[PDB]
Every structure is written in structure tokens, then in C-alpha cells.
Design an enzyme around this catalytic site. Structure first.
Site, mmCIF file in Angstrom:
data_model
loop_
_atom_site.group_PDB
_atom_site.id
_atom_site.type_symbol
_atom_site.label_atom_id
_atom_site.label_comp_id
_atom_site.label_asym_id
_atom_site.label_seq_id
_atom_site.Cartn_x
_atom_site.Cartn_y
_atom_site.Cartn_z
ATOM 1 N N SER A 70 0.898 -1.152 0.000
ATOM 2 C CA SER A 70 0.000 0.000 0.000
ATOM 3 C C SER A 70 0.950 1.218 0.000
ATOM 4 O O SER A 70 0.709 2.206 -0.704
ATOM 5 C CB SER A 70 -0.927 -0.001 1.231
ATOM 6 O OG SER A 70 -0.227 -0.317 2.418
ATOM 7 N N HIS A 91 10.852 -0.216 0.973
ATOM 8 C CA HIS A 91 11.048 -0.363 2.386
ATOM 9 C C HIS A 91 11.202 -1.790 2.821
ATOM 10 O O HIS A 91 10.461 -2.685 2.404
ATOM 11 C CB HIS A 91 9.909 0.304 3.168
ATOM 12 C CG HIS A 91 8.539 -0.268 2.918
ATOM 13 N ND1 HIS A 91 7.583 0.394 2.172
ATOM 14 C CD2 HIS A 91 7.920 -1.366 3.413
ATOM 15 C CE1 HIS A 91 6.441 -0.261 2.231
ATOM 16 N NE2 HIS A 91 6.619 -1.333 2.976
HETATM 17 N N1 LIG Z 1 3.714 7.048 10.116
HETATM 18 C C1 LIG Z 1 4.280 5.822 10.010
HETATM 19 N N2 LIG Z 1 5.354 5.411 10.730
HETATM 20 C C2 LIG Z 1 5.926 4.188 10.632
HETATM 21 N N3 LIG Z 1 5.496 3.212 9.801
HETATM 22 C C3 LIG Z 1 4.392 3.593 9.042
HETATM 23 C C4 LIG Z 1 3.739 4.810 9.068
HETATM 24 N N4 LIG Z 1 2.654 4.845 8.158
HETATM 25 C C5 LIG Z 1 2.703 3.639 7.620
HETATM 26 N N5 LIG Z 1 3.713 2.818 8.087
HETATM 27 C C6 LIG Z 1 3.790 1.323 7.944
HETATM 28 O O1 LIG Z 1 3.914 1.007 6.495
HETATM 29 C C7 LIG Z 1 3.946 -0.456 6.468
HETATM 30 C C8 LIG Z 1 3.221 -1.126 5.255
HETATM 31 O O2 LIG Z 1 3.868 -0.919 3.966
HETATM 32 P P1 LIG Z 1 3.601 -2.031 2.843
HETATM 33 O O3 LIG Z 1 4.317 -3.245 3.275
HETATM 34 O O4 LIG Z 1 4.312 -1.654 1.600
HETATM 35 C C9 LIG Z 1 1.987 -2.171 2.686
HETATM 36 P P2 LIG Z 1 0.781 -2.976 3.667
HETATM 37 O O5 LIG Z 1 0.894 -2.398 5.055
HETATM 38 O O6 LIG Z 1 -0.483 -2.707 2.897
HETATM 39 O O7 LIG Z 1 1.092 -4.403 3.681
HETATM 40 C C10 LIG Z 1 3.039 -0.885 7.628
HETATM 41 O O8 LIG Z 1 3.737 -1.765 8.513
HETATM 42 C C11 LIG Z 1 2.605 0.487 8.366
HETATM 43 O O9 LIG Z 1 2.392 0.607 9.797
#
Ligand SMILES: Nc1ncnc2c1ncn2[C@@H]1O[C@H](COP(=O)(O)CP(=O)(O)O)[C@@H](O)[C@H]1O
Lengths: 113, 113
Positions: free
Chosen positions: B94, B99
Site C-alpha cells: 500500500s 522499504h
Molecule cells: N507514520 C508511520 N510510521 C511508521 N510506519 C508507518 C507509518 N505509516 C505507515 N507505516 C507502515 O507502512 C507499512 C506497510 O507498507 P507495505 O508493506 O508496503 C503495505 P501494507 O501495510 O499494505 O502491507 C506498515 O507496517 C505500516 O504501519
């Protein structure tokens, strides 16, 4: 390149469905897949676990991934996939020669195990 | 830099419990932790997904991994841990900005999602 079953595979001592090979790595399908597409990218330099890798293995480690996304493209995995490196017990490592898992062909779920 | 949440964090708009930083990358705790110790390592330059990455970003990708292992070790994940990179849809992405996920504390299960 090592005293594990991945070494025997690298040495061609035993068979593996070899996907890609260059001078510093080898990609092959996992003998026990957890997804429709499940392959491994391993380096020929015997690094037992990622936590033991040197700053000087940075490009090599990045190569494994580079190779990882390439081979994924060539296996028709256009809808996405997951890459995983496991470190030790808690992490679930089965073989002590570092390696990258690439799994695709279905929805991967969260948490990642 | 970036349009994403992670571009916002690289540019300090919103804070983050920064574990590590350098010229190339940033490591911060995850706000939706999937294990006791769950942190992310993103590069400062904007690559949205791993399939759009050039062979040029190889050492920078190996670097996220090297820093991943450093941080896990610095956060004391001595029993093991797991690094997961998510690609596109099937991968469960998402957040469109490269990362590396690092998870520890509890036993990780197989398959990784
Ligand atoms: N403000 C934030 N600080 C730290 N991590 C964040 C923040 N916003 C989003 N993330 C993290 O982004 C990570 C997800 O990225 P993806 O692996 O690419 C997608 P998904 O969560 O749909 O599986 C999640 O673990 C989520 O908590």
C-alpha cells in the site's frame, strides 16, 4: 560454497530446478513451495546468516535482490510478490547459508508469519 | 523525498522514533507493529516499488539490508528476526516507496504470509 545442502546444489552435487545463475549467485525454485511461485536467490560466497554479513557484502546482498526482481518478472509474476530473508531461530531460518525467498502467485498475507 | 507518507517522514513533517539515519536511508519503528520488535528501513531517494529499481540501486538496497541487520542487533534481536520486502498488489503493498520490514521478538511462522 559451504557445508550445507545449498552448497551441494551450488556445486551441482545434487539437483535443483535452476532458474538463474551468474558468477556470484544462483536462483532456483524451492523444493517445498509456499506459493505457486517460490524460488530462492543465494550467493555463492558462504555467508551463514545475514547477521553475520559484512558492510563489504552490501553490493552482493543488493545483487541478490536485483536478481530477485528480474527472475520474478521472468516467471510471469506481474501482480506482486514478497521477498523474505530469515535470521536464525526466531526468524525461522532452515538453512545456514543466507538466502532470499521470493514468493508469488497468490495473495501474501499480513502478518508475514 | 516523496509524495508518500514516507516522503513526509524523510522530510520530517511527521515525526518517527528514528532508530538510525544516514545520507542514504532511514530506519524507524512501525506504527502497526506485527511482532514485538517491528521496524522499517527506507532509502531517502524515491523508488516506489522493487520492480522499478535499476541495477544502479544495488548497493543502496544491500545497504538497507546491512542497516536492517545492524538495527535488529542494536535493538537486541539476538534470537532471530525476519526481513520482508513487499512488491505490488500480490505482495501486499500500500506504501509505494521501497522499504525493508524487520520483525522480531516472537517466533516467526512459515509460510511468511
Ligand atoms: N507514520 C508511520 N510510521 C511508521 N510506519 C508507518 C507509518 N505509516 C505507515 N507505516 C507502515 O507502512 C507499512 C506497510 O507498507 P507495505 O508493506 O508496503 C503495505 P501494507 O501495510 O499494505 O502491507 C506498515 O507496517 C505500516 O504501519
Amino acid at each position: 560454497g559451504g557445508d550445507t545442502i545449498f552448497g551441494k546444489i551450488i556445486r551441482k552435487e545434487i539437483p535443483a530446478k535452476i532458474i538463474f545463475e551468474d558468477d556470484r549467485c544462483l536462483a532456483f525454485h524451492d523444493i517445498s513451495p509456499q506459493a505457486p511461485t517460490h524460488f530462492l536467490v543465494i550467493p555463492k560466497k558462504h555467508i551463514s546468516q545475514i547477521s553475520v554479513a559484512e558492510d563489504d557484502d552490501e553490493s552482493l546482498l543488493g545483487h541478490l535482490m536485483i536478481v530477485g526482481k528480474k527472475c520474478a518478472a521472468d516467471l510471469g509474476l506481474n501482480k506482486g510478490y514478497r521477498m523474505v530473508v530469515n535470521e536464525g531461530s526466531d526468524g525461522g531460518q532452515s538453512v545456514y547459508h543466507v538466502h532470499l525467498h521470493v514468493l508469488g502467485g497468490r495473495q501474501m498475507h499480513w502478518p508475514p508469519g
